[PDB]
C-alpha cells in the first residue's frame, strides 16, 4: 500500500504554517529537501517521543508542480479560485510549498521549521508564517469548541485520501489554506444566543442546534453538503488560533484536507456566494480571509523516491 | 506583605508585554493595576492544576512618578546605557512590564488579551514577545538554561526587598533585554569552543573546573562576590523566541534581584569587561536591541490602589 | 458495518441507565436513538483524547417490537429467570440500556444529562448506577477483575454478530445484573478460602492450577468449551458501586457476546449447578437484584 | 499545633458523610477519632503521590458536650436557622462530619468504608454525598466555582483559629448546606440574565464591573468588609453531585472560616437581604435541604484522645 | 489469522532480558511454561492497564528447538554464527530461551520474570540477566539518540514478521541478541565532531550527516544495506542502556528483530568483517560484544497450542 | 539558617545506594568532590525539572571523619555496633562514604552516580551498589506496604535533624544502612494471616492490627518505642526493593534517618536481642542483614565550605 503523510494526525495544541514561493533557479534545492523532509521530521521528533507528537505535512501548488516534476499531474490540482461574493471575497494569494507542522509544543514545531528553512535559504521566499496555539478546552478564537464533527477512522481515510480514481497519486490529499482575521469587538458585542445562531451549535455544551431552530445562514448549515449518493461530503479541518495583542490581530488559520478539492470548493461557494435560503455564511460577518492557496500533499513514498 | 509570583517554577511558555502610558492614561492604568491579580485568577483558575498561569507586573521610574504620590522604591531609576569598547547595552522606552508565564502559550495569550483590552486607548505597545522553552530546558544556543538559579530561602533573600526599604518589602527589580543571536556564526564553532564561551559542558551541563573555564566565559563574568565574600545572585528566566522566515533567533532576558545594583554589576562586567577579560564572549553571538528596568511591587500594594 | 464502542479500552468511571418506554414515548425514543452518536461526540470532543467517552445503546426484546417493523435479531428474547435450588437470577423490566464509560465521571454525567433531557416525558427510569474503578482494577471482593477478557481479533469474534445474522452484523448482546455483596460474610473467610471461591490468587491474580481449583469456583464454572474444543468467551466490564451509609457494596455486571446462548450457559452453570458443583460459590456472597438482556445494534442501524 | 488538611490541594472527588451519635455510642466514637489520622495514612499512603487522600473530621456543638469534659471552642453553637421573607436556611441534625477528598473516588470510598466499619452500632447516617469535579471547575449552574478562594498565607489567616482561642489554635469552623437546583428554571434564563444572578461572566469567569453588577447578585451579597475595611474571606469547596433519573442537580456547599461569624454574616445577607437587596438571586434557583455547623479541631487534639 | 507476539511493542522505558539454557530433563517443565506464558503476562499486567504496557517476547534457539518439538523447523533457525574479523570478534554464547520483557515500569518486568523463573527452577540455568532503562531523550550510553530510523506501521510488520515464504511459521520473527560493554574513557576523549564521524549523525540534534561527509566506516553507513530490488533492508532494533557505576560497566543491550536472520547477519558481517572501503564499523573500537545468540520468536498461538 | 541536605525528600520511585571506602592517599580527592556534590546534583537534575526530583544525600563514617577533618566531631558518630543475638546477627561491614541518590527515574540517579564516581576514580574502592525500584503500590518484597507510619512535616524535621543538643552540627542527620535478603520460599509457606502476625498490619489494606491481636514479637510492636517522657521515638525509613531473578535474590535496602543514632540503635536492639515479651523480631526469621554501616549526613553548607 502507498504510505500517506500524517494528514490524519489527531489535533495537537501547537502548529507552524509555513508558505513559501520557489525563486527562479531554486528547483533543485527544493527537490533535495523534499527527498529528506520525512528523515528531518524523525530527527527532530523521535528524541521527544512519546509526548512530542511532531509531524510535518508537505504540500505543492499547481504552478510549482510543473516546475518541479515531469510526467502525470494529480487530477484535481489547480490554483485556488478567487470567490467574489456580493459582500465577502475569498482572495487567492501566492504559495508554491506548504509545511503544516504540528506538535504538543511550539518549540518542537520551531526546531523542525528551522531545519527545513535552513536547507531552503537562497532558494525560496517566505509568503506566510503563523504560530498557532489551541485553547486548553479545544476552543477557537470565537470561544467555540472547534473540530467536533471531523471524520475519524475508516470514514476519515475515505474522505481525505486519493484512491483508485487517481491511482498514480493514491495516498495523497488536497489542502486548502485561508488565514482569517476576526473582528473580536463586534463578535463580543453579540449575546451568547446570537453567537450560537452564527455557528449552529451551543457555545458551552457543543450540542448541535435542532433542525427546527438552526438558521439556514449558520456556519454548520452552509458547510453541511450531501453528495450525489445522499451521503455527507466530509473534510478534515485543523483550525488554529493565532495573533498579536499589540497589533490587535485575532485570527483563525483554516486548513482543510479532502480527497478532491471539489468538496472544499463547494463549501467555500456556499459560504461566500450563498444559496437560495442564505445570502452568505454569518461567520464571514466577523471573519475576513487575507490568504487563499491550494496544495497537493503527496503520499510519503512519492517524496522519498525523488 | 504577599509578593507577586516572582519565584514561579520553570514554565514552557511566556508572553513579555512592554507598553508606554499615553497622555491622560494614568487613571485607566491604576484601575487595571487594582484588577490584574483578579484577571490572573479569572483566566488561570479554570485551567488548574496544569495551566500554572502567573503575571508579574512591573512599573518604570518615570511611570512611578506619574501614577503614585509618596515614597519611591530606593533603587528605582531608568535603565543605564552601557557603551562598551565593542558591545553596547541600549536603553529603550517602557512604563509597564507584564511578565506572563504558563505551561501553554494559549493561557498567556488569553491573559494578555484581557489586560490589553482594559488598556486600549491609554497605552502604546513597545514590545511583545511570545517565548517557548525547548523540551530539554535548552535555550536558542543549545545549552541548558537556569541551572544555577537560587531556590527556596536563598531565592527569597536574593530577589525580595526586605528591611533595607521597609515600605516596599516583598517587591523586586526586573531588568529586561531582548537579544538577537548570530546563529550562523554560533553553529560554525565546535561544541568544545561553544563550551569555552558559556563555561559549562553542552550535553551534560557540568560546570567547567576553575583551571579550564576562560576568564571571558559567560559563567566566569556573571559570577560576582560581594564585600562580605558572599555570591551575588539573581533569578533569570530567559526564554527563546523567533521567526524562521525573518531569520530572527532570540533570547528574551529577564533578571530579578532585591536591588538593581547586583544586575547592573553583572551587566558592567559583561559589556565593559575586567582586567582579565575584554567582554563576555556570549556578546560576540548576541546583540541587545531593548533594555528597561522595572520595580515589581508586592501584590497587596497593587490591590490597595 | 460500524459497531458501537462495545470493545472500549479500560475506563475508570461508568453510568448504567436502564429505562422503560412509556405508552406513546416511541417517536421521542427513535429521534434520540438517531442522535445519540452526535451527542457522544458533542460531550466527548472538548475532553479529547484522554476523556475516552463512549455510549453503547441497547434495546430489549419487547421494546424492539414496539419501535421497529421487519426483521428481529435472531437471539433477542427477554432475560430468562433462573430459579436454582438455593440462588435465583431475577428478570427485571428494561426497554433501553445506556452503557456510558469515560476516564472521568463528569463526562458520563454530562452525556447522561443530555440523553435523559431528550427523553423526559417518554421514559421511566428503572435503574441508575454510578460505577468507579477500585485501585488495581479490583472489584468489591478485593480481586482483580477483567484479566481473561479477550482482546483484538479474538474479542471481535467473541462479541460481534457476523454472517450467521447478516442484517444485524456488527451488533452484540448485553446481559446486565446488579449484584449486592455480603461483605461481612466475605471478610470472615481467610484469603486462601476466598481464592478457592474465585479460582485465582488474590494479591498476584495468578490462576489456581487445575489440581487445586475447586469445581464450584467462579473461574471453573464460567469456563465453557464449544463444539470445536475452543473456549466460549464473553467481554465482561464489571464496575464497583455502593453507598457506605446504606451498607451497599455492589458489582454491576455487564457481559457482551455475539449470541446470548454463551452468557446464558454460564448463568445456568452458576445458578442451577452441574453434576460436579451445587452452584457458583461467588453467589454465597452476591445477590442479583436486576437482570435484563439487550441487543446493541451496529452504529449505522441507529443512524438510519 | 498541626491543623487537619483544611487547606487541601485541588481534588476531583469527595465524599461528605454526616452522622448522629446514638445513645451510648460515645466511647466507640472517641476510639475512632483517636485513630482517624492512622486510617487516612493506611488507605492513602499506598496511592502516593497522586492519590492526595485527606479526611477532615468535624464535631457539632451538641456532640462536643457529649464527647469532651473540658473547655469548648469559643464559636461552637448549633447552626442558626434563617427564616427569610422568601427563602429559609434549615438546621438539620449532624454530630460528626467526614469531609473526604482525593484525586479518585475509590480512595474516598475505601476510607469512608473503614471509618463507618469502626462506627457501626454507634452512629446513624444522616447524609452521604459523592461529589465530582465537572469540566473546568464548573458547578451544576455552568459557572466556574472556587475562583476567589484565598491561597497561601491569606488562606491560613482566614481559616485557622489562632491566639483569639489559644486552646483550639489550628482548628476551623465548617458550615455545610446541601443545595438542589431548579435546572429547568435556570436554563430558561439568557446567559446575560444568569451572569446578573452570579456577578461574573459565564464562559470566561471575569467579574462584572461595579457599574453593572446587581446589588442582589451572589458575588455582591457574599462580598463583606470588616470593621477595618478589610475583606472577610472564607474557603468554599463546593462539589457538584446528582442523579439524572431523579432530576437531582446539586451543589454541596462547605465553607471553612476561623470564626463562624463570617460565614453566618454571609448567610444573613443571602437569606434575609440588605437595604439594597431582598435576597441572593442564586436562592431563586437553589434550595438548601441541610444545614449544620462543625468545629474541625487541630490534628493533635484528635490524636491525644481516649 | 496467526497472532504474533508483541514484537512491535509501543515505546517502553524499562526492560528485563533473561537468557537461560535448558538442563538435561528440563524439556517437559519448559513446554508447560511456554503454554502458560501469555496467561502469566495477563496475570501480572492486567491490574496496571492501560499505562503498564507489560509484554513478554519468548524466543527459542536452534538446538533447544530440536529438543522441544517434533516436525517442521523454522527455515532460518540456526545457531548464532561467530564472526572472527581481523580486529573485532562477534562471539557465540549459549542460550536456549530468551525472555524479552518490556513495560513502562521495572516492577511489572520484575514480577513477570519472577513468575516465569518460579515455574522453571530446576529445569533451566540462567546465562544472562540485564535490567535496561531509558536514558534521557532516548539516548544510549554513547550520548546519541538510539532508535530514530526503526521502521513503523506496515513497513515494520513487513520487515519483522514471517509471512508466506514459511507459511507454518507466519507471524514469527528472528531475534539476535548481543550484550555490548563500552570503553567510555576512550569515547569521551574524542571531540563531539569525531564522535559524529563514528556514528554518522549529529550528536545533539540527531540529524543524519549528508552523503558527502558521512565516512564509509561510520555505523550508519555500514548498517545501511540495499536488497536485490534496490530497496533498503530494515530490522527493528530495541537497544537498552544498562550498567553498574562501581564496576565501570556501561553497556548497550542490542536486540534486533527481522523476518529472516540473513538481513541482521549481513549487517553484522559488514560491521565485523568490513567492506572494500571500511575495515570495520568504528563503533566497535569503543564497544565489545560479550554475548551473541539467535532465537526464533514464534506466533503466540504456536505457544498456546502446546 | 543551616541548610540540611534533602533527607526529607518527597516520594521517589528509583534510587541508587553507593557505599565506598577511601583508599590510602584519597583524602584530598574526596574533600574536593564533597565541596562539588551539590553543584553536580543541580547540573544533572536541572534538565529534568520539575518532575525529576533528583537528590543526593552524602554521609561520612566515623573512621573516615577522623581521616578527612580536624577539630570537633558530631556527638553521636561511631562505627555501626554489631548485634550478636541468640539467633540473629546484625553484621558491621566497611563503608566510609554513602551516596543515597533518589529520583522519579533511574537514568537521573545513574548519571549523577557516574559523575560522582568519575571524580573519585583512583581514590575510593566500591563496597556496595544497589539499584532500587518502587514495587506496585509502595510494597516491599514481602508484599506489604512499606513507609506508611513515617513522620511528615514538622514532626519529621524534629525526629531527623540535629538541633541545639549538638549546635556545631545543627542541620545534620545520622543514617544507618542495612542490606537485607529475604527467604521468599519460607515466607510464601505462611498463610496471609500468619504473615500479618509477623508484620503487625493487614496485607492488602495496610490497616494496623488492633492492640488485642498484634503479637509482642511483630515488627510493628518491636519498632514502636516511647521515650522516658511518653513521646514516640520516630525515624524516617526509606526502604527500597532490589533483586536479581536469576540469582533468586529478593531484597530490601533499609536506610533509617534519625537526629541521634540512639533511637535507631534502640530499635535494632529490640529487633535482634529481643525484650522480656519477645525473643526477637519475627521479620528476621525471613530476612538476613548482609551489610551494616552508620554515617553522619552533614548540613549542606558544611560540605560547600570545604
Ligand atoms: C473563520 C474560519 C472558521 C472558523 C472559526 C470555523 C469554526 C467552526 C466551528 C466552531 C465549527 C463547529 C464544530 C465543528 O464541527 O468543528 C465548524 C464546523 C465546520 N466547519 Fe468551520 N470554521 C471556519 C472556516 C471554515 C471553512 C472555510 C470551511 C470550509 C471550507 C469550514 C468547514 C466546516 C465544516 C465542514 C464543519 C462541520 C459541519 C458539520 O458537518 O457539522 N469551516 N467550524
Ligand atoms: C544574552 C543571552 C543570555 C543567554 C543566552 C544566557 C545563557 C546562560 C546559560 C546557558 C547559563 C548557564 C546555565 C545557568 O546557570 O543558567 C547562564 C548562566 C547565568 N547567566 Fe546568563 N545568559 C544570557 C544573559 C545574561 C545576562 C544579561 C545576565 C546578567 C545580567 C546573565 C546572568 C547569568 C548568571 C548570573 C548566570 C549564573 C552564573 C553562575 O553559575 O553563577 N545572563 N546564562
Ligand atoms: C457478582 C458478580 C461478579 C463478580 C464479582 C465477578 C468477578 C470475577 C473475577 C474476580 C474474575 C477473575 C478475573 C477475570 O478474569 O476477570 C472473573 C472471571 C470471569 N467471570 Fe466473573 N464475576 C461476576 C459475575 C459474572 C457473571 C454473571 C458471569 C457470566 C455470565 C461471569 C463470567 C466470568 C468469566 C467468563 C470469567 C473468565 C473465566 C476464565 O476464563 O478464566 N462473571 N469474574
Ligand atoms: C448553591 C449554592 C452556591 C453556589 C452554586 C455558589 C456558586 C458560586 C460561584 C459560581 C461563585 C463565583 C466564583 C468564585 O469565586 O468561587 C461564588 C462565589 C462565592 N460564594 Fe458561592 N455559591 C453557593 C453558596 C454559597 C454560600 C452558602 C456562601 C456563603 C455562606 C457562598 C460564598 C461565596 C463567596 C464568599 C464567594 C466569593 C465572592 C467574592 O469575594 O468574589 N456561596 N459562589
Ligand atoms: C554497540 C552497539 C550499538 C549501538 C550503541 C548502536 C547505536 C546506533 C545509533 C546511535 C544509530 C543511529 C540512530 C538510529 O537510527 O537508531 C543506530 C542505527 C542503526 N543501527 Fe545501531 N547500534 C549498535 C549496534 C548495532 C547492531 C549490532 C546492528 C545490526 C546488526 C545495528 C544496526 C543498526 C541499524 C540498521 C541502524 C539504522 C541505520 C539507518 O538506516 O539509518 N546496530 N545504531
PDB file of C-alpha atoms and ligand atoms in Angstrom, chain A residues 46, chain E residues 140-142 144-150 176 178 180 182 199 201 206 208 219-221 223-225 232-235 237 239 252 254 263-265 267-268 271-272 281 283-284 287-288, ligand 5:
ATOM      1  CA  UNK A  46      11.986  10.864  17.758  1.00  0.00           C
TER       2      UNK A  46
ATOM      3  CA  UNK E 140      22.305   5.290  24.656  1.00  0.00           C
ATOM      4  CA  UNK E 141      25.461   5.205  26.844  1.00  0.00           C
ATOM      5  CA  UNK E 142      27.482   6.894  23.984  1.00  0.00           C
ATOM      6  CA  UNK E 144      23.492   9.528  20.933  1.00  0.00           C
ATOM      7  CA  UNK E 145      19.737   9.195  20.233  1.00  0.00           C
ATOM      8  CA  UNK E 146      19.098   5.495  19.500  1.00  0.00           C
ATOM      9  CA  UNK E 147      16.030   4.153  17.533  1.00  0.00           C
ATOM     10  CA  UNK E 148      15.488   7.067  15.074  1.00  0.00           C
ATOM     11  CA  UNK E 149      15.438   5.076  11.763  1.00  0.00           C
ATOM     12  CA  UNK E 150      13.473   1.995  13.030  1.00  0.00           C
ATOM     13  CA  UNK E 176      19.658 -11.640  17.504  1.00  0.00           C
ATOM     14  CA  UNK E 178      24.387  -9.120  21.755  1.00  0.00           C
ATOM     15  CA  UNK E 180      27.907  -4.732  24.416  1.00  0.00           C
ATOM     16  CA  UNK E 182      31.617   0.385  26.059  1.00  0.00           C
ATOM     17  CA  UNK E 199      28.034   7.214  14.326  1.00  0.00           C
ATOM     18  CA  UNK E 201      24.609  11.573  12.773  1.00  0.00           C
ATOM     19  CA  UNK E 206      20.199  13.650  15.652  1.00  0.00           C
ATOM     20  CA  UNK E 208      21.956  12.447   9.624  1.00  0.00           C
ATOM     21  CA  UNK E 219      27.903   2.904  11.968  1.00  0.00           C
ATOM     22  CA  UNK E 220      25.018   4.353   9.877  1.00  0.00           C
ATOM     23  CA  UNK E 221      26.934   3.800   6.537  1.00  0.00           C
ATOM     24  CA  UNK E 223      24.305  -0.831   8.661  1.00  0.00           C
ATOM     25  CA  UNK E 224      22.632   0.783   5.560  1.00  0.00           C
ATOM     26  CA  UNK E 225      22.146  -2.193   3.128  1.00  0.00           C
ATOM     27  CA  UNK E 232      16.686  -0.826   1.879  1.00  0.00           C
ATOM     28  CA  UNK E 233      16.861  -3.945   4.097  1.00  0.00           C
ATOM     29  CA  UNK E 234      15.415  -2.959   7.528  1.00  0.00           C
ATOM     30  CA  UNK E 235      15.372  -4.521  11.046  1.00  0.00           C
ATOM     31  CA  UNK E 237      16.394  -2.702  16.967  1.00  0.00           C
ATOM     32  CA  UNK E 239      18.677  -1.158  22.197  1.00  0.00           C
ATOM     33  CA  UNK E 252      24.084  -1.334  25.305  1.00  0.00           C
ATOM     34  CA  UNK E 254      21.272  -4.959  21.407  1.00  0.00           C
ATOM     35  CA  UNK E 263      19.330  -9.346   6.981  1.00  0.00           C
ATOM     36  CA  UNK E 264      20.755  -8.991  10.541  1.00  0.00           C
ATOM     37  CA  UNK E 265      23.677 -11.349   9.643  1.00  0.00           C
ATOM     38  CA  UNK E 267      24.693  -6.089   8.838  1.00  0.00           C
ATOM     39  CA  UNK E 268      26.933  -7.961  11.399  1.00  0.00           C
ATOM     40  CA  UNK E 271      30.356  -4.320  10.920  1.00  0.00           C
ATOM     41  CA  UNK E 272      32.866  -7.047  11.975  1.00  0.00           C
ATOM     42  CA  UNK E 281      32.432  -0.353  11.975  1.00  0.00           C
ATOM     43  CA  UNK E 283      31.551   1.866  16.817  1.00  0.00           C
ATOM     44  CA  UNK E 284      33.374  -1.468  17.557  1.00  0.00           C
ATOM     45  CA  UNK E 287      32.163  -1.439  22.035  1.00  0.00           C
ATOM     46  CA  UNK E 288      32.931  -5.123  22.868  1.00  0.00           C
TER      47      UNK E 288
HETATM   48  C1  LIG G   5      27.144  -1.039  20.418  1.00  0.00           C
HETATM   49  C2  LIG G   5      26.001  -1.315  19.899  1.00  0.00           C
HETATM   50  C3  LIG G   5      25.174  -0.337  19.200  1.00  0.00           C
HETATM   51  C4  LIG G   5      24.973   0.999  19.356  1.00  0.00           C
HETATM   52  C5  LIG G   5      25.385   1.805  20.558  1.00  0.00           C
HETATM   53  C6  LIG G   5      24.169   1.422  18.255  1.00  0.00           C
HETATM   54  C7  LIG G   5      23.724   2.749  18.069  1.00  0.00           C
HETATM   55  C8  LIG G   5      23.063   3.207  16.944  1.00  0.00           C
HETATM   56  C9  LIG G   5      22.791   4.590  16.684  1.00  0.00           C
HETATM   57  C10 LIG G   5      23.135   5.726  17.635  1.00  0.00           C
HETATM   58  C11 LIG G   5      22.113   4.674  15.486  1.00  0.00           C
HETATM   59  C12 LIG G   5      21.617   5.945  14.876  1.00  0.00           C
HETATM   60  C13 LIG G   5      20.147   6.235  15.239  1.00  0.00           C
HETATM   61  C14 LIG G   5      19.182   5.148  14.814  1.00  0.00           C
HETATM   62  O1  LIG G   5      18.672   5.140  13.664  1.00  0.00           O
HETATM   63  O2  LIG G   5      18.896   4.248  15.630  1.00  0.00           O
HETATM   64  C15 LIG G   5      21.993   3.335  15.005  1.00  0.00           C
HETATM   65  C16 LIG G   5      21.372   2.980  13.830  1.00  0.00           C
HETATM   66  C17 LIG G   5      21.360   1.626  13.402  1.00  0.00           C
HETATM   67  N1  LIG G   5      21.962   0.525  13.977  1.00  0.00           N
HETATM   68 FE1  LIG G   5      22.960   0.509  15.616  1.00  0.00          FE
HETATM   69  N2  LIG G   5      23.945   0.398  17.410  1.00  0.00           N
HETATM   70  C18 LIG G   5      24.578  -0.703  17.920  1.00  0.00           C
HETATM   71  C19 LIG G   5      24.652  -1.986  17.385  1.00  0.00           C
HETATM   72  C20 LIG G   5      24.023  -2.371  16.208  1.00  0.00           C
HETATM   73  C21 LIG G   5      23.974  -3.680  15.609  1.00  0.00           C
HETATM   74  C22 LIG G   5      24.708  -4.868  16.138  1.00  0.00           C
HETATM   75  C23 LIG G   5      23.264  -3.619  14.460  1.00  0.00           C
HETATM   76  C24 LIG G   5      22.878  -4.636  13.427  1.00  0.00           C
HETATM   77  C25 LIG G   5      23.131  -5.901  13.485  1.00  0.00           C
HETATM   78  C26 LIG G   5      22.817  -2.252  14.357  1.00  0.00           C
HETATM   79  C27 LIG G   5      22.004  -1.803  13.340  1.00  0.00           C
HETATM   80  C28 LIG G   5      21.628  -0.526  13.191  1.00  0.00           C
HETATM   81  C29 LIG G   5      20.782  -0.131  12.084  1.00  0.00           C
HETATM   82  C30 LIG G   5      20.223  -0.981  10.959  1.00  0.00           C
HETATM   83  C31 LIG G   5      20.624   1.231  12.208  1.00  0.00           C
HETATM   84  C32 LIG G   5      19.842   2.202  11.315  1.00  0.00           C
HETATM   85  C33 LIG G   5      20.738   2.760  10.203  1.00  0.00           C
HETATM   86  C34 LIG G   5      19.967   3.643   9.218  1.00  0.00           C
HETATM   87  O3  LIG G   5      19.412   3.119   8.224  1.00  0.00           O
HETATM   88  O4  LIG G   5      19.867   4.867   9.464  1.00  0.00           O
HETATM   89  N3  LIG G   5      23.337  -1.532  15.417  1.00  0.00           N
HETATM   90  N4  LIG G   5      22.591   2.462  15.923  1.00  0.00           N
END
